[PDB]
Amino acid sequence: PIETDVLILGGGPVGMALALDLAHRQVGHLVVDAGDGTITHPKVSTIGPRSMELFRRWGVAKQIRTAGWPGDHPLDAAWVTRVGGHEVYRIPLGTADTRATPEHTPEPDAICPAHWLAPLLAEAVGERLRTRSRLDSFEQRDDHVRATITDLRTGATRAVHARYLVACDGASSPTRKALGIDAPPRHRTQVFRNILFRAPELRSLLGERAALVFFLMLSSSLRFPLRSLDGRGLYNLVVGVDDMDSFELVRRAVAFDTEIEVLSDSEWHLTHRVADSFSAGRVFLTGDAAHTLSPSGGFGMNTGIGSAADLGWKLAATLRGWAGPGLLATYEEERRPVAITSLEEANVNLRRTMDRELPPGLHDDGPRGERIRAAVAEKLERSGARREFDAPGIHFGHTYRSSIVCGEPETEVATGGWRPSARPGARAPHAWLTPTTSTLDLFGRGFVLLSFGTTDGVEAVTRAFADRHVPLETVTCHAPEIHALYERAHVLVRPDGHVAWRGDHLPAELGGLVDKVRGAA
Numbered sequence: 001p002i003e004t005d006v007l008i009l010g011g012g013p014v015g016m017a018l019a020l021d022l023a024h025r026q027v028g029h030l031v032v033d034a035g036d037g038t039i040t041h042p043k044v045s046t047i048g049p050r051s052m053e054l055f056r057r058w059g060v061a062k063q064i065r066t067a068g069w070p071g072d073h074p075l076d077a078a079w080v081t082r083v084g085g086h087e088v089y090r091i092p093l094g095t096a097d098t099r100a101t102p103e104h105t106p107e108p109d110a111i112c113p114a115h116w117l118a119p120l121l122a123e124a125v126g127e128r129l130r131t132r133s134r135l136d137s138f139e140q141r142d143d144h145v146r147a148t149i150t151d152l153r154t155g156a157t158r159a160v161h162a163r164y165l166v167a168c169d170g171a172s173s174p175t176r177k178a179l180g181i182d183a184p185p186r187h188r189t190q191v192f193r194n195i196l197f198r199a200p201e202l203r204s205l206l207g208e209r210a211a212l213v214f215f216l217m218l219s220s221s222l223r224f225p226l227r228s229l230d231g232r233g234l235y236n237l238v239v240g241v242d243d244m245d246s247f248e249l250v251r252r253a254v255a256f257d258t259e260i261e262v263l264s265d266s267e268w269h270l271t272h273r274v275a276d277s278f279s280a281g282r283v284f285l286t287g288d289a290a291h292t293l294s295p296s297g298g299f300g301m302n303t304g305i306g307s308a309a310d311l312g313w314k315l316a317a318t319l320r321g322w323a324g325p326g327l328l329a330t331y332e333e334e335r336r337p338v339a340i341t342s343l344e345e346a347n348v349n350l351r352r353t354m355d356r357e358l359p360p361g362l363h364d365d366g367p368r369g370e371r372i373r374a375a376v377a378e379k380l381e382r383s384g385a386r387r388e389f390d391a392p393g394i395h396f397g398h399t400y401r402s403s404i405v406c407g408e409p410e411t412e413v414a415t416g417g418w419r420p421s422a423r424p425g426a427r428a429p430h431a432w433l434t435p436t437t438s439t440l441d442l443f444g445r446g447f448v449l450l451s452f453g454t455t456d457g458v459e460a461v462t463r464a465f466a467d468r469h470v471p472l473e474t475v476t477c478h479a480p481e482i483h484a485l486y487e488r489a490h491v492l493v494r495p496d497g498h499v500a501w502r503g504d505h506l507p508a509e510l511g512g513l514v515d516k517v518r519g520a521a
């Protein structure tokens, strides 16, 4: 019977993210996955900027960026009648090599299709990953969990003893079901096909017209994205199952007489499900097992990676012994509302496409179809089409309102686009300490107290943390620009990079503050 602190069920992006977070917190763990880490049908390709900030923390951001996506491939989204047909609307998004690094983050989004990401993540996790292994059954005990690890090549079964079991086993989570936890549908389930294909000369023919993603505007079945996966000949076409031959569907979508090789054609379900509970005893749900949503926006894998990072520090805190008895409970308390609002935002992007009218005369050339296209273009812009491709709020703007956060007033009524804020509950904002060091590079270990222009009360804060063995680092900053951004003289940041408390003056009961933020109050 082999034993580990945490047993991770699932070796997809989410499970691997949790493994990386545990390794960087020196927590003993183990990943088991039914597969080798070779994706035959790559699904996801876009990694959001918050996820990249986390990959930067874990030291794999650089290798993700240099993994093979061409620096000169356009990142645009465009709506067209057919690929190589008439163009209706385009959002220019530059290239990797030419776009300006954004002011609010050191890590812009990245393209890394699953068949590059999987081996790259397998490499950084090392031998703690266990491939071709399935979990057949588990049993909860008082101080640990016991599970059955059956080798898929061999057929034989083994036993693992872990303090905690974390289920990252996808949208049809067998773990979730065996716990009796429901995940009701919040919107209609839809059926689509994914056609993966090679088209080696397509990029050359498109030339200036190339895009990261095309939205087709052909028929009721072909109104969905066709995306360039590796920028080197690999593409995926999304086809709706309303109630045709694979090659023929691609031919309809692409108005070039060019080489096309269909690799696979697989059906998938678009679902909107969030679990009623994210844990039961020592068993935790994360990733799709906890929450699935519409990929329209690319929020799904990023929400999972963010949840993995949240669960990660709390598990570590509990195993170290400085956590309060209620800390683990805040995982569901904080992350579940995040899944819900992300789901609903993803569904808005989806409905924009589903409700969009495809008027007659759209495909006809000349002056009349040219006018019709120009009219639709105007309606596309007014519908907020670019929000699907520029959504800082969904990536950076979630604000925790929980029992371990010393929250401020304000309601939830937006007044402008998202803007960086150091308010309690929120992601502490990026700024350049030096040209090489971000404020983000201070976070990710224990708690951090950022003080501007002073060290008053700091010795007291340190003692209060030490008396409960809670890890704390204190940093003094003298940049007025950074002080203005954070708006307060003292800012207390959590192990996950979110603010727990801020103020011009430290509280009188520093012990009460400590117990509060560790989940003991």
Ligand SMILES: Cc1cc2nc3c(=O)[nH]c(=O)nc-3n(C[C@H](O)[C@H](O)[C@H](O)COP(=O)(O)OP(=O)(O)OC[C@H]3O[C@@H](n4cnc5c(N)ncnc54)[C@H](O)[C@@H]3O)c2cc1C
Pocket (backbone or CB within 6 Å): 009, 010, 011, 012, 013, 014, 015, 032, 033, 034, 035, 043, 044, 045, 046, 047, 048, 133, 134, 135, 136, 168, 169, 170, 171, 174, 194, 268, 286, 287, 288, 289, 295, 298, 299, 300, 301, 302, 303, 304
């Ligand atoms: C077509 C499509 C496109 C998408 N595009 C994007 C995108 O561009 N950006 C984005 O952010 N998100 C995207 N998503 C969402 C993304 O796919 C999911 O959020 C994510 O893949 C799920 O994370 P996960 O690792 O928890 O689940 P999975 O990726 O399903 O991980 C499950 C893994 O666990 C293993 N496993 C399962 N059961 C067992 C068992 N009993 N024993 C052992 N091992 C087991 C399996 O081997 C599997 O590899 C997309 C989704 C789809 C369907």
Ligand SMILES: O=C1NCc2c1c1c3ccccc3[nH]c1c1[nH]c3ccccc3c21
Pocket (backbone or CB within 6 Å): 043, 044, 045, 046, 224, 225, 238, 295, 296, 297, 298, 350, 353, 388, 389
């Ligand atoms: O990666 C994807 N895979 C599918 C997908 C994806 C993305 C997607 C990925 C990154 C950014 C925006 C995105 N919008 C969509 C999408 N909008 C859609 C509408 C109908 C059917 C599928 C999609 C869709």
